[PDB]
Amino acid sequence: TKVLFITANPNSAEGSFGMAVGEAFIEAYKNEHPQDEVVTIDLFNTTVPAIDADVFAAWGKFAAGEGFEALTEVQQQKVAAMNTNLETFMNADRYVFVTPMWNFSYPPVVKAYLDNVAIAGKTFKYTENGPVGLLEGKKALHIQATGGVYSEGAYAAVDFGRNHLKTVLGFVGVNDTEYIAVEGMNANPEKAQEIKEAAIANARELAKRF
Amino acid sequence: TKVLFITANPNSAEGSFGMAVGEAFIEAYKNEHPQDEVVTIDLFNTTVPAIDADVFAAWGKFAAGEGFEALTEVQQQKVAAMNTNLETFMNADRYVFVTPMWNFSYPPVVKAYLDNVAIAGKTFKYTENGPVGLLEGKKALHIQATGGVYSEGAYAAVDFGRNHLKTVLGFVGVNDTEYIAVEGMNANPEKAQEIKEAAIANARELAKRF
Ligand SMILES: Cc1cc2nc3c(=O)[nH]c(=O)nc-3n(C[C@H](O)[C@H](O)[C@H](O)COP(=O)(O)O)c2cc1C
Ligand SMILES: Cc1cc2nc3c(=O)[nH]c(=O)nc-3n(C[C@H](O)[C@H](O)[C@H](O)COP(=O)(O)O)c2cc1C
Ligand SMILES: O=S(=O)(O)c1ccc(/N=N/c2ccc(O)c3ccccc23)cc1
C-alpha cells in the first residue's frame, strides 16, 4: 500500500494546526502499517506547473501527433513535471491532503495540483451520459484547519476548499473519502490547544481504520 | 472611474470563449465611457506571489514592528509585488474578471490573486460578529466560460470558481456583482458559435448599464 501525504502548508507541524494533526495521523498510520510506503509531497517544495500557454501549446503538439522533442525546453520541463505528479498520483493507493483555509478556500497550489492530476484518458474519461473517473481502489483523507467553524450547518456552504477538493476526487473516481476538521481556533483562542488535541485523537483513531 | 480588466486565460480573444466575450464587454464599455481609465491585469503575465514561508516570515517582522529592510531580498520582492496588486485593487472602482472553468473551478492564479487582495486592515477588518469588508463604492463582473452548463439548477452547486469568487468579493465589501456565463459549448459543439454570439450580445448590452 502506497500512501501520498500531500501537504499545502508553508509551516511545519510546529506552527500549523493542520500539519500537527496530519503528522499525528501519518505516524499513527505508520505504526499500524510498518510495511506501507508513505511519500511526502510538500506542494510548497514540489514543482507543480500551472496550466498556461506553454502547456496548451505542448498539448496541441501532442494532439497533432508530434513527440516530446517538438516542445521547447520550458515546455518539456512543465510537461515532465506534470506527468511525474500524475503518474505518482495514479499509482498510489491512498491520499492524505493537509490544507489550511485561506479566504474560504485552499492555497492556490492545491488547485494547481488538481489540474495536474485530473487528465482525460488517464484519471477520467468521456462517456455518453458524461465524464466518469478511471481510478479504482483508492481512498482519500482531507484534514483542513480553519479559524472559524464550517464543518456542519450554514457555513458549510462557504467551505469551498473542502467541497471542491471532494468534488474533484470524486470526479476522478476516488469516492471513498474521509474528512477531519481542525476548527474554531480563531473563534475561540483559549480553546485552541483542546481543539488541536481532540483533532489529534480523532486522527489517531482514524489511522487504525484507514 | 477606474476599471480593472483582470484576465486569467492563457489564450487571447481569438482562441478563448471567455476572452472573446470579455473583450467585447470591455471595448463596448470604453466606447460608452471614453474618459474612464481601464487597466488590464493579465494574471498569466503579472507577478502574483503565492503566500508562502517567505511571506509569513515577512508579515511576522511587520507584526514585530520591524521595517522593510528587515526582510531578505526575496521577501522584499514578494511583498512589494503583493502591495502593488493590493493597492491597484483598492484604488479601482470596478473589477471585471475573465476565467475559464478548469476542473470545476478557476485557474490557480485567481486564488493567488484573491490572496493578494484580501488583507486584514486594508480590505476587511475583524468585528464582534465576524469579519466585514472595508471596500465601498465598488462593482464587479465575472465572465466565466464553461464546457457544461452550471449557471442555474442542480449543477450550480459545483460551480466553485464562480461561487468562491463572489464570496471573496462580497467578503471584502464588493456585494454588487454581475455574472455572465458562456456555457454549454462542449455539451453542444455545433451550437458553440451561437452560444458565443449570444454571450457577446449580452456583454455589449451590460456594458451600457455597468
Ligand atoms: C492568509 C490567511 C487567510 C485565512 N482565511 C480564513 C478564512 O477565510 N476563514 C477562516 O475561518 N479562517 C481563515 N484563516 C485562519 C486560518 O484558517 C487558521 O489560522 C488555520 O488554523 C490555518 O491553518 P494552519 O494552522 O494549519 O496553518 C486565514 C489565515 C490566513 C493566514
Ligand atoms: C484543463 C481544462 C479543464 C476543464 N474543466 C472543465 C470542467 O470541470 N467542467 C466543464 O464543464 N468544462 C471544463 N473544461 C472545458 C472548458 O471549461 C471550456 O473549454 C471553456 O471554453 C474554457 O474557457 P475558454 O474557452 O475561455 O478558455 C475544461 C477545459 C480545460 C482545458
Ligand atoms: O467563527 S467566526 O465566526 O468567528 C469566524 C472566524 C474567522 C472567519 N474568517 N476569518 C478570516 C477571513 C479571511 C482572512 O483572510 C483571514 C486571515 C486571518 C485570520 C482570519 C481570517 C470567519 C468567521
Ligand SMILES: O=S(=O)(O)c1ccc(/N=N/c2ccc(O)c3ccccc23)cc1
Ligand atoms: O454538459 S455536460 O453534462 O455534457 C458536461 C460536459 C463537460 C463536463 N466537464 N468536463 C470536463 C471536466 C474536467 C476536465 O479537466 C475537462 C477538460 C477538457 C474538456 C472537458 C473537461 C461536465 C459536464
